[PDB]
Amino acid sequence: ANRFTSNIKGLTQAARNANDGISVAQTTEGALSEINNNLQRIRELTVQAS
Amino acid sequence: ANRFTSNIKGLTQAARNANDGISVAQTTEGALSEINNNLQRIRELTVQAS
Secondary structure, three states: OHHHHHHHHHHHHHHHHHHHHHHHHHHHHHHHHHHHHHHHHHHHHHHHHO | OHHHHHHHHHHHHHHHHHHHHHHHHHHHHHHHHHHHHHHHHHHHHHHHHO
């Protein structure tokens, strides 16, 4: 019973670590998309400058 | 989708550039019209002096 309790609490602890990881991933993806917007705009008006 | 958006914006700006070029072409042809008028008038009136 003690072993099962410790194992269960370990998995519960790991779950929120995984959620923290997904939060990091979403934040990085948002930043990357914001950068992609500027890249697309530059790709746009580079044709105009050409 | 990102590649599609980039291509679409580039092609739209390309169409605008082509419109700029066609406008330049009509302007040059317009000037050539006044040049042609003077040359034709000179050619016709040369015979009178001849």
